[PDB]
């Protein structure tokens, strides 16, 4: 087993699915291109990756590729709007001019709105799913996978997170609440709807959920740490290595959640969580 190779491959798979979902020949072409300019714009493809690995650990990864496309679209909508001047500005990141730069504000507005829909669309469409699916239980899975996806996006998930940040020195409970609900929510969605589309038991699904809940914080705590290298934050409130201590705990927290699985099939979920921690981005 080689993890980086694994990531490279899944990223490509997700990318291909994404290209496939949006035909650049259909008529509101600028809009479709705008969607493509947003969605296909590189990236590591981590959320689709968790969803997928969550399906194989509990069923096989092509079952949950539509949902892996969905959360990566959901996430894209979470960035096309974040870059808008009304909200965060920061027009250019990676090496790409942000979507509102190339197409203006309103196209950037409708591009997130098209994706959000497309993600829910693509997930509901049975045209999206492979044939070697246990046809019976699987439809009922897709309903709850959509509704788990839906539960983490709206007023009980990211938006609550996007907003509390937009409130503006800050206390801890409220700090971890924001993170737990702007990053950790989307990851819960991915690995659960991945587990659901895998067909896993509730025990399996829930354990994977608090798995993601921890690597959710873990994700953005590190982001608040790597900032020091080369807005109220975690090393400010606790101290630097008081934040490397906290980080070290959340990892170990997530690991013993995979206690119930076999490291065999979960080796991706393990190497994943490790990547999120010691990333030097």
């Amino acid at each position: 087993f080689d993890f980086n190779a694994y990531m490279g491959e899944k990223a490509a798979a997700v990318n291909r699915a994404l290209d496939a979902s949006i035909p650049a020949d259909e008529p509101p072409a600028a809009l479709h291109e705008a969607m493509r300019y947003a969605l296909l714009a590189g990236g590591k493809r981590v959320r689709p990756a968790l969803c997928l690995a969550a399906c194989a650990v509990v069923g096989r990864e092509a079952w949950a590729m539509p949902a892996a496309a969905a959360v990566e679209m959901v996430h894209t909508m979470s960035l096309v709007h974040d870059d808008l001047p009304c909200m965060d500005d920061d027009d250019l990141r990676r090496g790409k001019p942000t979507c509102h730069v190339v197409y203006g504000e309103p196209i950037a507005v409708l591009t997130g709105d098209a994706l959000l829909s497309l993600s829910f669309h693509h997930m509901a469409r049975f045209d999206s799913y492979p044939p070697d699916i246990d046809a019976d239980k699987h439809p009922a899975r897709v309903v709850r996978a959509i509704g788990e996806l839906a539960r983490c996006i709206g007023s009980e998930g990211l938006v609550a997170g996007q907003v509390v940040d937009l409130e503006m020195t800050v206390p801890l409970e409220r700090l971890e609440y924001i993170h737990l609900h702007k990053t950790a929510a989307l990851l819960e969605a991915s690995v659960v709807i991945g587990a659901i589309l895998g067909g896993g038991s509730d025990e399996q699904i829930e354990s994977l959920r608090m798995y993601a809940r921890s690597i959710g914080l873990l994700f953005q705590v590190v982001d608040d740490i790597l900032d020091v290298t080369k807005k109220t934050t975690y090393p400010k409130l606790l101290g630097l290595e008081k934040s490397r201590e906290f980080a070290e705990k959340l990892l170990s927290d997530a690991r013993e959640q995979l206690s119930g699985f076999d490291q065999e099939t979960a080796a991706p979920l393990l190497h994943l969580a490790n990547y999120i921690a010691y990333r030097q981005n």
Partner: protein, 262 residues
């Protein structure tokens, strides 16, 4: 008939108790679906083929949420730029975030009611969710809004209603359709009705205009025609409606005449 009134009151009640004030943006959502004709067409269309309704009420509720979600986004400042606003009340900031919470609110309310077991087996359900998503997706409505960002006059170029105001009732019909067991023969049949009843209400209204929001028809072209498209959409719609046999479809018709006038 007023029947419509009854339906609307019921829709409003489930919505209020769907959006509760609890914390946090929530206050903002309520002021977006609080402050004709897509939802009702569906319940009634749904009544057809005779399906217990509580089965279609969720769809209607989801529908109004969807309408509002992209409503907020259509009179956002960076669109029309000419005059209270749902966006200028909580800030263009939360405004965006709000509609972004309403899309998944619909799909969540839909999955909750719209009881899956018993009638409405899930495959039907996915079909419904897909229909709503498509309705607001790149193909329809968002494309309609995009088209309608200003040019305006075309003989067949002028039909953005078909995608902006058209493909919102199109599903609303097609949604009703699948709920009560409509056949494919009746799939586009019932849906053809939706597209062209959505245009009607708007196309008629572009005489006097609190609604949803350029590229109007009268300004765009000869009124005689505008007034002419009306019968052409009435007649067409009437054809599709007539397909139905074994009434009551008395109700499916009055929808065409309520439009003329409020």
């Amino acid at each position: 008939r007023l029947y419509w009134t009854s339906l609307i009151a019921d829709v409003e009640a489930e919505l209020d108790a769907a959006m509760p004030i609890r914390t946090p943006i929530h206050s903002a959502m309520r002021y977006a679906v609080l402050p004709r004709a897509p939802p009702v067409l569906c319940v009634a269309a749904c009544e057809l083929l005779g399906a217990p309704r509580e089965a279609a009420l969720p769809a209607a509720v989801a529908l109004e949420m969807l309408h509002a979600a992209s409503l907020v986004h259509d009179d956002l400042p960076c669109f029309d730029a000419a005059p209270p606003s749902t966006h200028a009340a909580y800030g263009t900031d939360m405004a965006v975030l709000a509609g972004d919470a309403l899309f998944p609110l619909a799909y969540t309310h839909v999955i909750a009611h719209t009881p899956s077991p018993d009638p409405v087996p899930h495959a039907v359900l996915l079909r419904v969710l897909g229909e709503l998503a498509r309705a607001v997706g790149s193909t329809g409505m968002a494309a309609g809004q995009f088209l309608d960002l200003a040019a305006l006059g075309e003989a067949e170029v002028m039909k953005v209603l078909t995608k902006k105001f058209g493909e919102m009732a199109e599903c609303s019909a097609a949604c009703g359709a699948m709920l009560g067991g409509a056949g494919p023969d009746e799939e586009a049949a019932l849906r053809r009705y939706g597209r062209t009843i959505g245009v009607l209400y708007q196309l008629v209204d572009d005489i006097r205009s609190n609604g949803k929001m350029n590229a109007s028809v009268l300004r765009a072209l000869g009124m005689d025609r505008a007034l002419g498209i009306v019968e052409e959409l009435k007649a067409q719609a009437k054809m599709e409606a007539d397909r139905f046999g074994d009434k009551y479809g008395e109700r499916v018709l009055p929808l065409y005449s309520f439009v003329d006038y409020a």
